[PDB]
Curated annotation (Swiss-Prot), chain A:
Organism of this sequence: Homo sapiens
Subcellular compartments: Cytoplasm
Modified residues (Phosphoserine): S27, S32
Location of Phosphothreonine modifications: T3
The name this protein goes by in its record: Large ribosomal subunit protein uL4
Section covered of the full-length record: 264 to 316 of 427
Curated annotation (Swiss-Prot), chain B:
Biological role stated in the UniProt entry: Component of the large ribosomal subunit. The ribosome is a large ribonucleoprotein complex responsible for the synthesis of proteins in the cell.
Effect of L50S: In DBA18; uncertain significance
Disordered: annotated span: 150-187
Family classification: Belongs to the eukaryotic ribosomal protein eL18 family.
Subunit description: Component of the large ribosomal subunit.
Transmembrane intervals: none
Keywords in alphabetical order: Cytoplasm, Diamond-Blackfan anemia, Disease variant, Endoplasmic reticulum, Isopeptide bond, Phosphoprotein, Ribonucleoprotein, Ribosomal protein, Ubl conjugation
Localization: Cytoplasm, Cytosol; Cytoplasm; Rough endoplasmic reticulum
Gene: RPL18
Residue location of crosslink Glycyl lysine isopeptide (Lys-Gly) (interchain with G-Cter in SUMO2): K118, K163
Modification sites for Phosphoserine: S129
Protein name as catalogued: Large ribosomal subunit protein eL18
Coiled coil: none
UniProtKB/Swiss-Prot annotation, chain C:
Name of the protein in question: Large ribosomal subunit protein uL30
Transmembrane segments annotated in the record for this chain: none
Family: Belongs to the universal ribosomal protein uL30 family.
Quaternary data: Component of the large ribosomal subunit. Homodimer. Interacts with DHX33.
From-to range in the entire protein, with total length: 137 to 192 of 248
GO biological process, one term: cytoplasmic translation
From Swiss-Prot, chain F:
Region (Disordered): 1-37
Organism this protein belongs to: Homo sapiens
Domain of life: Eukaryota
One GO CC term on file: membrane
Location(s) in or outside the cell: Cytoplasm
UniProt modified residues of type N6-acetyllysine: K46, K54, K109
Descriptive protein name: Large ribosomal subunit protein uL15
Any one of the GO BP annotations: cytoplasmic translation
Gene name for this UniProt entry: RPL27A
Compositional bias of kind Basic residues: 1-29
Keywords recorded for this protein, A-Z: Acetylation, Cytoplasm, Hydroxylation, Phosphoprotein, Ribonucleoprotein, Ribosomal protein
InterPro entries given in the database record: Rbsml_uL15_N, Ribosomal_uL15, Ribosomal_uL15/eL18, Ribosomal_uL15/eL18_sf, Ribosomal_uL15_CS
Length: 53, 187, 56, 52, 125, 147, 128
RNA sequence: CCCCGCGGACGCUACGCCGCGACGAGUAGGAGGGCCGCUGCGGUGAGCCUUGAAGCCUAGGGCGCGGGCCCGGGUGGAGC
RNA sequence: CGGCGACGUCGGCUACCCACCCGACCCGUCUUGAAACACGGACCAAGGAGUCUAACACGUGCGCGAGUCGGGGGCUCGCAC
RNA sequence: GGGGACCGUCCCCCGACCGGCGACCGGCCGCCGCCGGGCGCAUUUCCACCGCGGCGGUGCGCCGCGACCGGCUCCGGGACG
RNA sequence: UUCAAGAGGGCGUGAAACCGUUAAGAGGUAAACGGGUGGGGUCCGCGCAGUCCGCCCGGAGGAUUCAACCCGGCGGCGGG
């Protein structure tokens, strides 16, 4: 089936298919400092309905 | 009751990809988080493009990308396309390009890399510019499809230049009556 | 005219309409005017920052 | 009898599927999720000598 | 990768039970036995599971080592805690918290250990 | 998959999506392209102008091989040879220009769409267009003819 | 005596009767299973007063008390002991019940294991 | 520079969970969802079953807005 | 905060029978209009009706991409699959 | 026609420097945690029981009562301008 | 006789329509139906002095041993 840097020698036109996402580690990508520097702070407070008195 | 109309309540738009591709869904998760948690509008545009269908993500050729990246002030910027980058054999000189694409044709990739360029996926683009700073967001020709030749006013109306649907093209196929003044009329 | 009854409200009418049944169109939503901050966020740029300003 | 029983798949698609299946056969979570009792297997890409 | 493998097994798995509007997952190292990314006991580089001991007393705390991810034979280290309930819970708490070893499962493991020990003490009349 | 179709959803609805008034009858309006000049005239004139009538000369026993003549444009001309050919020609100190035989690659006529790089080249073809020949000569090339 | 759930809210059922099919009273060939009337003149479909009511989404149960037994638990069907252990960490919200085709000797063991695990069984004395 | 306490609920099937606001007629017709239902095939449940399958009966217990479903008792006798 | 609690009573709005008040014309269908003095329908069981092929058009998903496609043929102990 | 030269990709090596030991791993150390065995044998620790014990959560088998708070609402008195 | 004739030669199971008998209830506006209650009946609830469990206090009892150190094993993290 070939390497990514050499085609298959027993299929005459085939090469391994390419990834559209090199690093699929979503957790590492999100925890990375470069992503975290660009974010706004979380809005983790819940604002429930106020009973109109 | 209230006096309102409900025929426009539901807005028709992609809220997610119709694709079940797990890598696409993973980078959709990534850019969904980026769009929510940053103020950048680049991330929102990229996310809504990731939702889109294939006809709404037309391929971008190497020549068109080079032409758009040669414009003044775009030096050392990352060309971002949400779609496939296609080799154009009509060009001979490939400059050094930094490129981020959803897909790259094998020949286009080899040409870009031997020209000294760099290719990134969208997770790498998120790690490189999380807000999309220093990017040129490109798009392939959306109306560069055969169906848009048939779309429009009907072929048999005056001042319409829309292609008709014919099984064959020849002097016997839809050329006589309604096409020339000698056979009835032309319009 | 056949579909409405209208007239000239007085100060007490304006007060009671705003205070008992006053709701704001905030971000396209019907939000009860339970805090002056709701008025000040939307109409503060016009000098209206409280229910008294709105009533005036 | 002429119901079009057969389908033709692109060779590139079929090769893609083979590659995906091979890649997934080397991840213990996916093999365990197919339910294959790979618990004392010393190495999931399990390779044995040619004398077999 | 955990996210990639989760996208594969989130709905197609032999451990999946979808029944009575409920969803359960029965892989060996799943605390709370729920079909979830956080609690899946197969897709992560480090997992912790609490099981009843081989005999009818104690618990087994099994944690996934770091190196042999593709070698399931040696990938899990199991230890047996056969002490009183408070010391057992303290031991599990120290395994998870002090090691910084996946601290989002600390209370799940403590509660599962409590359930196991409570099931091991004799039934009443 | 028949389980994905409207017929599964139309169970219980009496008319099966075809209306109670006009119903689903056998062939209201005719069969095939019936009445294309009588009661489907608006459709035919609107979407297929030129449908009716004869135009031009008929020719019995047309042999398409006789008129077979595929074409290639000047912007794709350099793709008929290897990359090495063009690179060596560009860096060649002498005036030696490579030969591109488009007949070998499977084209007979060379059309002149696009521009050429500034490299002399000898092009062999059965036919040329005026602008293709002009553009080949403007880069210092030559056009030779084959039969 | 019985194991009690985590919380015991008041279950409010908007409707307690079944929706019977129109004219299922007049015929044996028509079962009481609900079918939407689609006749051009049907008064049940047109919603005339005093007629058979039509099921619609407004009758939906509160999502906090939906699928909830009168005991306060939610049932989960089990066919063996291994399926029973999935409720170990859901003792106080979900109750197991043994499938109808599980043999008597095997459901005895399931009942014993559920007693050990403090899992409530809705049919604990069912083949004996 | 946390330490007499070494400790601190839940969560996040991200196709998930949460919040807020407005709204809810419908033939013909269109669309979506269906952990609605039937039969067969590939996988999977170290699934169920002569200590009793299917089917059928039932003033039995329930769940779901509903399509329907689960469980008890009986009959049945080999598969689901 | 009170009362009551095993062979008599306690709870179970669902489920069986019955009573009463209010409401309630027989469905399907064609029709501007059906409860119709319009038609079909005594009852029950089982069966019973948008399918397959070909050709187009647009939409969607996938692969490759100025290419793409082996579908016809051929090669691999000829054949449990 | 061969055999060569060159070019482009490759496959292994000899090697110096560069980023990192990484989600490719071992050895040493340092910290931490766990387990097993000793020592520790009592103001420590753990186990089960009792009190109609206190504090927390859920909640009372059934039938009921009261209180205050808040939301909505319909009324009634009194007083001021 | 048989496991079973509640398998007895058109005999596996044995639905509905329809019919006989038994039991309960009812009955001058043909029956039947929707909503709301009530009465009776059949069943269900291990109903019948009514839940558990975390900590602390007190009392009455047991037992290895609690911490800390020593040895060994195994992991997590870091290391120019
Ligand atoms: Mg409407
Ligand atoms: Mg309709
Ligand atoms: Mg008509
Ligand atoms: Mg109901
Ligand atoms: Mg009926
Ligand atoms: Mg009508
Ligand atoms: Mg409304
Ligand atoms: Mg509606
Ligand atoms: Mg009719
Ligand atoms: Mg008429
Ligand atoms: Mg009618
Ligand atoms: Mg009449
Ligand atoms: Mg008549
Ligand atoms: Mg008629
Ligand atoms: Mg008939
Ligand atoms: Mg008749
Ligand atoms: Mg039928
Ligand atoms: Mg028998
Ligand atoms: Mg018989
Ligand atoms: Mg009878």
């Amino acid at each position: 089936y070939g390497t990514w840097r050499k085609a298959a020698s027993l299929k005459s036109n085939y090469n391994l298919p390419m990834h559209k996402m090199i690093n699929t580690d979503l957790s590492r990508i999100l925890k990375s400092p470069e992503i975290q520097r660009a974010l706004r702070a979380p809005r983790k407070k819940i604002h429930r309905r106020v009973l109109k008195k | 009751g209230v006096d309102i109309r409900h025929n426009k309540d539901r807005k028709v738009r992609r809220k997610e990809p119709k694709s079940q591709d797990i890598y696409l869904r993973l980078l959709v998760k990534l850019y969904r988080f980026l769009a929510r948690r940053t103020n950048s509008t680049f991330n929102q545009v990229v996310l809504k493009r990731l939702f889109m269908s294939r006809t709404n993500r037309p391929p971008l050729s190497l020549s068109r990308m080079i032409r758009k990246m040669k414009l003044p002030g775009r030096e050392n910027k990352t060309a971002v396309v949400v779609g496939t980058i296609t080799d154009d054999v009509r060009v001979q000189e490939v400059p050094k390009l930094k490129v981020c694409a959803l897909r790259v044709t094998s020949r286009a990739r080899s040409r870009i890399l031997r020209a000294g360029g760099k290719i990134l996926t969208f997770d790498q683009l998120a790690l490189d510019s999380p807000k999309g700073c220093g990017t040129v967001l490109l798009s392939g020709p959306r109306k560069g499809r055969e169906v848009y030749r048939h779309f429009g006013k009907a072929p048999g109306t005056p001042h319409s230049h829309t292609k008709p649907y014919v099984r064959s093209k020849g002097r016997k196929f839809e050329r006589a009556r309604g096409r020339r003044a000698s056979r009835g009329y032309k319009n | 005219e056949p579909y409405i009854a209208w007239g000239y409200p007085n100060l007490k009418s304006v007060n009671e309409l705003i205070y008992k049944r006053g709701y704001g169109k905030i971000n396209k939503k019907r939000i009860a005017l339970t805090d002056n901050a709701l008025i000040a966020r939307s109409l503060g740029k016009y000098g209206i920052i409280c229910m008294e300003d709105l009533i005036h | 009898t002429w119901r079009r029983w057969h389908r033709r798949v692109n060779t590139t698609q079929k090769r893609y599927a083979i590659c995906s299946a091979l890649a997934a056969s080397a991840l213990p979570a996916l093999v365990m999720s197919k339910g294959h009792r790979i618990e004392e297997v010393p190495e999931l890409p399990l390779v044995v000598e040619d004398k077999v | 990768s955990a996210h990639l493998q989760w996208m594969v097994v989130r709905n197609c798995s032999s451990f999946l039970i979808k029944r009575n509007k409920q969803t359960y997952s029965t892989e060996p190292n799943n605390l709370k036995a729920r079909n979830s990314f956080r609690y899946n006991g197969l897709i992560h580089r480090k997992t912790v599971g609490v099981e009843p001991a081989a005999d009818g007393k104690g618990v087994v705390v099994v944690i996934k080592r770091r190196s042999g991810q593709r070698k399931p034979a040696t990938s899990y280290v199991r230890t047996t805690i056969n002490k009183n309930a408070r010391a057992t819970l303290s031991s599990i708490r120290h395994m998870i918290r002090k090691n910084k070893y996946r601290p989002d499962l600390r209370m799940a493991a403590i509660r599962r250990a409590s359930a196991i020990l409570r099931s091991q003490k004799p039934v009443m009349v | 998959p028949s389980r994905l179709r409207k017929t599964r959803k139309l169970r219980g609805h009496v008319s099966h999506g075809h209306g109670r008034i006009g119903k689903h009858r056998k062939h209201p309006g005719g069969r095939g392209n019936a009445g294309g000049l009588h009661h489907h005239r608006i459709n035919f004139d609107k979407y297929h102008p030129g449908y009716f009538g004869k135009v031009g000369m008929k020719h019995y026993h047309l042999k398409r091989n006789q008129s077979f003549c595929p074409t290639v444009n000047l912007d794709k001309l350099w793709t008929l040879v290897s990359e090495q050919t063009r690179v060596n020609a560009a860096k060649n100190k002498t005036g030696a220009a490579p030969i591109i035989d488009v007949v070998r690659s499977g084209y007979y006529k060379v059309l002149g769409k696009g521009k050429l790089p500034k490299q002399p080249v000898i092009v062999k073809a059965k036919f040329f267009s005026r602008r293709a020949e002009e553009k080949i000569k403007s880069v210092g090339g030559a056009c030779v003819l084959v039969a | 005596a019985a194991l009690r759930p985590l919380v015991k809210p008041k279950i409010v059922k908007k409707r307690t009767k079944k929706f019977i099919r129109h004219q299922s009273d007049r015929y044996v060939k028509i079962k009481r299973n609900w079918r939407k009337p689609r006749g051009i003149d049907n008064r049940v479909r047109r919603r005339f007063k005093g007629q058979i009511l039509m099921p619609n989404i407004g009758y939906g149960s509160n999502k906090k008390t939906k699928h909830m037994l009168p005991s306060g638990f939610r049932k989960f069907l089990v066919h063996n002991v291994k399926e029973l252990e999935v409720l170990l960490m859901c003792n106080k919200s979900y109750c197991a019940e043994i499938a109808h085709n599980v043999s008597s000797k095997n459901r005895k063991a399931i009942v014993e294991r559920a007693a050990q695990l403090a899992i409530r069984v809705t049919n604990p004395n069912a083949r004996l």
